[PDB]
Design a binder for this molecule. Structure first.
Ligand SMILES: CCC(=O)Nc1cc(Nc2nccc(-c3cn(C)c4ccccc34)n2)c(OC)cc1N(C)CCN(C)C
Ligand SMILES: [Ca+2]
Length: 316
């Protein structure tokens, strides 16, 4: 069919309504703070991440963050990052749901001794659900990676970073890029060679992300530099089977790395397979002391008065 009106609402927030509390990170993206958003007179406090950029002076900083805002305002799914609004101060700030446990790559690196097979398989299920939703929305992410998955709780993760995301027209079936830095080691071969991006190249990146999780955050092709990756992949070489993975799981990864993009799994099928595996996790991932491992959860604690606060439960 054809092209439906995007009737998403973009909400403009007054800077009055949110209190920054701590800086979380800074660098190329700008500076991300954690804070509280209090819509006036509604008796709620919503933990948020506020992304400023370095300078009000660069018009393509503003253009890039506004494109990110367009994309994020157009998605609504429990496993995709939740955009709350933008504030049009001198520095244009993007306000999203605070994800207290950080990015998933560093989370697995930091907690590898406490991560059982249940958590890993559930994360794969949830990531596949988010990506299948994005495919439903005809959105190609183009930067799926463990660093670009955020952790609301150990039981709940969401896909983030839509800085390279592209929405396809209904008649479009692929996006053709024109230069610009791209993460080679997560990229499908046809993306590396012809700058072609599809939902199936996103499937390739999903495979690499799963490899990251199953190795507890190892760097893919650790030694190799990016220029060699193309011919490495052309020779037929792929990432190795992680120690904890049965052949059942590794075969799924390998299918994600097929050269024929149409022979790769579709995201709905990855949902199905990984949930089947999640129903008997120790049969598909072999982790020592798996049975005794447990992970944290919130117990109502931060630096403030917080009787009036919550997060995903603030609709409209
Ligand atoms: C820097 C890695 C990281 O994720 N840090 C982190 C993030 C959040 N929260 C959160 N929520 C939504 C968005 C973001 C976010 C989005 N962008 C684009 C960002 C860029 C830089 C930093 C954060 C964000 N961050 C957090 O919440 C309390 C705590 C932490 N840490 C201090 C734990 C870090 N760990 C490795 C030791
Ligand atoms: Ca509200």
């Amino acid at each position: 069919g054809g092209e439906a009106p995007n009737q998403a609402l973009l909400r403009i927030l007054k800077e009055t309504e949110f209190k920054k509390i701590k800086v979380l990170g800074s660098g190329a993206f700008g500076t991300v703070y954690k804070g509280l958003w209090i819509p006036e007179g509604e008796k709620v406090k919503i933990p948020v991440a506020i992304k400023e950029l370095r300078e009000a002076t660069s018009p393509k900083a503003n253009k890039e963050i506004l494109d990110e805002a367009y994309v994020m305002a157009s998605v609504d799914n429990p496993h995709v990052c939740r955009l709350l609004g933008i504030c049009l101060t001198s520095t244009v700030q993007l306000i999203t749901q605070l994800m207290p446990f950080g990015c998933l790559l560093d989370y697995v690196r930091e907690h590898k001794d406490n991560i059982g097979s249940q958590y890993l398989l559930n994360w794969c299920v949830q990531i596949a659900k988010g990506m299948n939703y994005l495919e439903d929305r005809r959105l190609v992410h183009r930067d799926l990676a463990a660093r670009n998955v955020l952790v609301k709780t150990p039981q709940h993760v969401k896909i983030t970073d839509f800085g390279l995301a592209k929405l396809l027209g209904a008649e479009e079936k692929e996006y053709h890029a024109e230069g610009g830095k791209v993460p080679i080691k997560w990229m499908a071969l046809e993306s590396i060679l012809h700058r072609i991006y599809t939902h199936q190249s996103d499937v390739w990146s999903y495979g690499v992300t799963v490899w990251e999780l199953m190795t507890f955050g190892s760097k893919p092709y650790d030694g190799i530099p990016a220029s060699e990756i193309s011919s490495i992949l052309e020779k037929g070489e792929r990432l190795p089977q992680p120690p904890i993975c049965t052949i059942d799981v590794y075969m799924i990864m390998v299918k994600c790395w097929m050269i024929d993009a149409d022979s790769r799994p579709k995201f709905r099928e990855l949902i199905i397979e990984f949930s089947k595996m999640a129903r008997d996790p120790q049969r598909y991932l072999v982790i020592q002391g798996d049975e005794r491992m447990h992970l944290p959860s919130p117990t109502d604690s931060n630096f403030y008065r917080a009787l009036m606060d919550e997060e995903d439960m603030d609709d409209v």
